[PDB]
Design a protein around this ligand. Structure first.
Ligand code: AMP
Length: 124
């Protein structure tokens, strides 16, 4: 079973580019990270900083998670991210996403040893 830490990297980590190059980044990334598998994952964010920078958020600003747990952390700095959101028109298995480049603070939930992000809670 893929660990939560590994799933996070699959779903949300893309250190390759430092931002979304093309307008159909989301279409490719959502496919290649297996997020369009049995359905279209409607919303997903990709983060474009080093794994080490993202992992480090786990020792930054402690905040409540949406689900009300206390193991969430907000990045001190803004980060290069990309919001993928399914278009009004999209339909499985032809999944369609708008790509939006952004610089925002990320909020992640951290777990395990080592203490690393396991959930992407929000960007702000
Ligand atoms: N570690 C986590 N911290 C906060 N919310 C989570 C976590 N894992 C999953 N969730 C989010 O909550 C949903 C499942 O409910 P729960 O994990 O119990 O809060 C998932 O669809 C996620 O959006």
């Amino acid at each position: 079973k893929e660990t939560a830490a590994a799933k996070f990297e699959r779903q949300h980590m893309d250190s390759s580019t430092s931002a979304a190059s093309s307008s159909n980044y989301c279409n490719q990334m959502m496919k290649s990270r297996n997020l369009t598998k049995d359905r279209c994952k409607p919303v997903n964010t990709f983060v474009h900083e080093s794994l080490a920078d993202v992992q480090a958020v786990c020792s930054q600003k402690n905040v409540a998670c949406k689900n009300g747990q206390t193991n969430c952390y907000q990045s001190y700095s803004t980060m290069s991210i990309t919001d993928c959101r399914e278009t009004g028109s999209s339909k499985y298995p032809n999944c369609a996403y708008k790509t939006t480049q952004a610089n925002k603070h990320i909020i992640v939930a951290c777990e395990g040893n080592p203490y690393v992000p396991v959930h992407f809670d929000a960007s702000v």
